[PDB]
Each structure stands twice: as C-alpha cells, then as structure tokens.
Design a binder for this molecule. Sequence first.
Ligand code: STL
Ligand code: STL
Lengths: 388, 388
Amino acid sequence: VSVSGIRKVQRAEGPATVLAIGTANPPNCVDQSTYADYYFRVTNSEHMTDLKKKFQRICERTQIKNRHMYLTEEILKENPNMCAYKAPSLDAREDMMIREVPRVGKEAATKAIKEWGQPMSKITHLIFCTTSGVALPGVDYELIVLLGLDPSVKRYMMYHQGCFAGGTVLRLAKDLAENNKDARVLIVCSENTSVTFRGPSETDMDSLVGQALFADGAAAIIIGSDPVPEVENPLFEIVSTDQQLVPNSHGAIGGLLREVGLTFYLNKSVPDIISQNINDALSKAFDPLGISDYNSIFWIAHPGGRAILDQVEEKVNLKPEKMKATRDVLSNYGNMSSACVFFIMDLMRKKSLEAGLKTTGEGLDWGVLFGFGPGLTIETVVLRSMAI
Amino acid sequence: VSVSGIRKVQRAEGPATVLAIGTANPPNCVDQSTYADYYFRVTNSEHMTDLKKKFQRICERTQIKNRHMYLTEEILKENPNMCAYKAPSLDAREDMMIREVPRVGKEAATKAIKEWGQPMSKITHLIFCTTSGVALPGVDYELIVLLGLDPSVKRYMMYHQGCFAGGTVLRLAKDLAENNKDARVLIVCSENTSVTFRGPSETDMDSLVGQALFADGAAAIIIGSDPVPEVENPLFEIVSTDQQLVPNSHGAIGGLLREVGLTFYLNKSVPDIISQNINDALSKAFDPLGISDYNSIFWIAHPGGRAILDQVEEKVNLKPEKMKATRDVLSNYGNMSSACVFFIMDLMRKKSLEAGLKTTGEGLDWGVLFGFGPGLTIETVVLRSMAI
Ligand SMILES: Oc1ccc(/C=C/c2cc(O)cc(O)c2)cc1
Ligand SMILES: Oc1ccc(/C=C/c2cc(O)cc(O)c2)cc1
C-alpha cells in the first residue's frame, strides 16, 4: 500500500562489508625468466632473433616471476590459429573462455562460501565479471548451475569491462548490499587469457607487451550490509566509490573483439596519465574524511604494470612498503585483470593477521583501492579496515 | 569518521521513480507484408521456393506490421558475408554495431533529457544495455562523449544480456537511485540487428524465425528517488523487482557470439514455459500487495512474440485489452529486445494522458512489467502508476 513503508523496512542499514574472500587459478604455473623462449618457440617466431631478445628484456623488467595459465603448450598445439599473430580463432578462444571461466570462478566461490560459513541459499545477488566468453545464457548462468545457487538470485553479467573492473564490482556491490536488507552479494571476477593470446608481430609491440603481463585467476567476494554478530566476520567496509574518465585517454588502453580474438593496445604514456591524475582522485575521496597523508592509509592498487606502480609511488611519495602487497601479487600471479585487487586484499588481511596487527588494513584504519583501465578510467574505492 | 553517519545522510529516501522517457530508431522502416520476398532476394535464396512460402507464412502470423532497421539493401550489398547463412563477418557486424548503437542511443537520450528538463551535469549514473558491439572502452564510453556527460558518471556496461534485459536495467537502476541521494540515473537500451542478420538455412529454422522478429530502436529512461516538486515529473515508481530461472530452460532461448555474427536458438516451447511459470512470478510479486485480480492492474510485457502474448493472456485470463499496448508496439516496431518494454511504457502513458485517465497506468494504480530471455529468465517488476 505504501511504497514509502515498504522502502523503509526493506533497506539495509549499515555500510557494505566484505565478509569473506576466495581465490583460485589454473594449476599450470608458467615461469617468467624462461617465457620469452617458450613464447617464441610455440609461435615459431624464432627467426625474429631481435624481437626475441627484445622480448626477454621486456619479460625481465616485468617484475613478474610467475603466472598461472590455462593455455598449455599442448592446448596451443591443437590450436595453430591461436599461436599466429592474427588468424581466425574467435570461436576456439571463446569456447575455452566459456568452459574455463565459470569453472575456475566456482573454485574461488566455494572457498569464499566455506569461509563465510553461511548456506548458499542466502546469496541474494550475483555479480559475474569476466573479460569475455560470450554465450546466452551467459557465464553467470553456468556459475549458478555449477555452484547450485538459488534460481531467483539477481544476476549482473559484467562483460568486457577492462582492467579497472575490480573497483566496478565493489562500486556496484555496495548499492546492492546497502539498499536491500539481508542482501548478501557474491562477486566473481574470473579472468582467462585464452582470448588475448596470440603470436608476435614485428609491427605490433603493444600486443607483444601484453603477452608478458596477462595471467589467469578468479576471486570470489561475499559482500553484505549489517554483519551478523559472531556468525559473520567483517573484513573491510566499502566507504565510498568514484569512477573517473581522464580527458585524452581513449588511445591509452583499449581493444576490440575481432575474429582473431581480443586485440588490445597499451600506450606507454599510461603510468604518466595515472600519476598525473591520481592525486585529484585521492583528494576527491579522502578530503571529505580529513585524510591528507596518503601514507597514513593502506593501499591496494591494480598492478597494471610495474611502471604504473613506480610512477604513482613517485608522484604520491609513498614509502616503499605501501606497494609491497600489490607488487607481491604481481610477482606471483601477474596481471589477472579485475582479479588482482582481490588477491591483494586477500593477501593484505592474510598477512596482517599473521603479523599480529590490530586491523586487516596493515594495522591501519583507512585505505584506498584503485582500478585502472580502458578510455583511461580510474576507480577510487575508499575502504575502512576491520579490527583484530 | 562514522561510516554509519555518512551512510545515513548519503542515501536516498523514497522509491526509484521514472521521470522521463525518450525513444528513437533507424529512419529506415521495413514493411512486413513484403519482407519474405525482400529477404529471400538479397540473400539469393530464391531457389529455396518452399522455404520462401514457409517464410511468408511465418511473417504473416508474426503480428508485426513494421520494423525499423539500420541495415539497408545497400548496406547488405557491400556486405556479402552478412547475407550468407554462415560466413565470417563478425568484424563488419561489430563495426556497424559499435558505430550505430551509441549513435541511436544518444538520439533517445536527448529526447529524454529534454523532457526531464534538468542539466546533463545532474546525471550521476549511466546504464548502457546493448546486445553487442564490443570495444574497450565500450559503447557507454562513446555515449558519454557524444552526449557530453560528466567525466565522473558511474557507468554500468550491460553487454549480451538477452531479451529480458528490459527488467534488468530497472532492477539495477532501482538500487542506484534509492541508495544515493540526488542520484539520477540514465538508462539507454540500444538494440541493433546488424549482428543477428544472416541468410536462410534449410536446416536452421529457429534462425529463420528470428529474421522475421528482431528490429532496431533505442530508449532512454531517467530514474531517480525523491522527485523534486514541480520541477521533476514522476511517471511510474519501481516497487519491486525479481528475477527467476525456470528449470529445464537453457535450450529454449540462447545463442553464441561466433565469427559469423550472433547465432541464436528459439525453441517453440517458449510460450508454454512462460505461461506455465508466469503465475508463480505474478503471485510472488503481487501477494505481498494484496493483489489477486491480474486484470485490476495494467500490463507491460516483453513482446518476444505474439504466441507468448496469446499464451500468457490465455493462462492468466486477461481481458484482450490488457495486452493492447504491448501488441501495439510489436506491430509498429517488432522485437527490439530490451527496448520494447520502454516503448510500451512510453506508449501507455502517452495514451493514458491523451485519454484523460487519472493515472499513467491506464487509469489504474498498479501494474507489472515482464521480461523474457535466455536460460529462460523471467524478470517481474512491479510498478505503481503516477497521478493525472
Ligand atoms: O586473464 C586475462 C587477464 C587480463 C586480460 C587483459 C584484458 C585487457 C584487454 C584490453 O583490450 C585492454 C587491457 O587493458 C585489458 C585478458 C585475460
Ligand atoms: O536489435 C536487436 C533486437 C533483438 C536481437 C535479438 C537478440 C537475441 C539473441 C539471442 O541469442 C537470443 C534471443 O532470445 C535474443 C538482436 C538485435
């Protein structure tokens, strides 16, 4: 009768809170210090002698030591079109994407749900964020089946978002959890390189650089407002979440879905673009909270690349350590796109707890989470750590 | 300092409300009573004599009289791969999709914004829902540029959702508008058939049926909680929004993104699946509100096809008229996927007002909005009409 009364009683009351986290990747670990050779070998670009040495240089300064990858030297054999620079292979890539994406996402979810300790039945919303794997019904549908979620879970299929999608989900999860009482949201960001992998091109360097970065791996996050005492354990609270487009950026990061898989460009000016726009976002989100010292807060930045980390650290003037967790994930996993920030969040708390610190935010109270991607989008999420 | 206080002051207070609507389609109107010939002509499937007559039969019982289409007999000439049943054409289709989708979406938005009367600067969120046109940054990015939206508008790129995406956006818009004070959301659902069009196959009937249904057209909807008196005009209020998966449905509606464009299947059992599951959703959403007579409320159903309309009307026992608006849109526009429901909502109020009725819901107070799509998803949105 009263849309006003229904509203008043059906809305959550507190801020969105991260209650559990889970992560998993393809078993196959690929070593970085020997990737340049492996790569030029299975692509048969050995005669590109120069480009090869040049690729080891890249792989070295990569700051990455390991990366999980579904694609194996075997899977690459049965798929010649995927080893070539540009060759019709969209169908093959998508089929691996569609099969493997939900599969790994479920492994991450199970771990998260086990931690959370609650019954799946309680999951009210589902946010599935993947770079690709287009099918109707989508990847989320498969996840519901595999996992056995409720047939009335409200779904949100985020396709082809970009490396900044990490903050996107949190931004979206916030409103879902905070507007509906008992809303418990499941975030699953599964990224797989089956669509971005291809052979080298003497003319396409941007593409050659991505081959040394992108890795595989999923992450499941349980989010919900008004934590049940004792039963549920809050880890972090979503305080605020902004998104922003930097002018003159479209040509920086991007790509298209072609018949030869996902193509992409990464302009060298990225670390700069971020560095020269990162402060405005910082102030925009911490001024309202009286924070001026960006060292008094913990950090979780999307490891788009080492250079980005060096530049932001250099501009904002952060002690080394601030980026220790972030770099730590990059080194053992590489750039799993939207998944990285949650592997870092998981790493931060897991360590803070094994260190005896007073909070999950490296003993600190406030922290910021970034996300960097296409059109040069920046997503600033402000977090509030939880005690003990 | 108090994530509890920030929350208390930054949240909207009333229910999400539709304040303006705008729609636009490709100028090119294609006549249905002569489509079977046109279609078999530009595809060069004239020798398929039987299939051709069979296609006119389909086109006739279609219940569609007109459909706007970007694709012209000229554009089809310069694109032989798109006239063939299955032929590598993903790149061409996507490029039209990417260029035309945002373009038409902006025309719809301008009209909506003009109506709303407020400055664009006030648009806080952007929900872009299209069946395809994959690029990074995505179609939403382009819309921001074309339209001149703020560089900090929170974006939500809904790609490849399905014919049920109409309710999806409303479901999502609700939480956005209702959780953030002053949040004014822009919903743009632009659907274009450049990706689903192809030639006939003596073996692929499901595909032949879609060629007689799918049309072009965009729709922009302004949504926001706590209407400004006099300045803003509320049209409908979002009361509740559920989503549901019918067991044993995946094979009913669906499709994949292939190198030959978007493929799709439409199983004849759909009108049944809906009809035999439509009541549960109805009760689920109207019982809490004491509504038992589904004729005492106005209706806005996704015109997935005439048969679906006939079956639901037959099961629920609705006077003819209940589906008069819905069928009216289908006849002049066809199935523009996620756009249809908003062209119907626009049509309902536009007529109710020119009829002298007391509300925008055909003089009634409550109404329901449906959405039907892949994996056989049903989205039940309950609306509350606005006065005069
Ligand atoms: O598992 C994966 C992890 C990361 C990626 C990379 C995606 C991507 C594609 C682009 O067009 C732009 C880029 O900035 C991001 C692909 C697979
Ligand atoms: O403008 C357009 C309007 C509608 C469509 C149809 C999309 C579609 C594709 C499928 O796999 C399943 C189907 O149920 C829906 C495409 C373009």
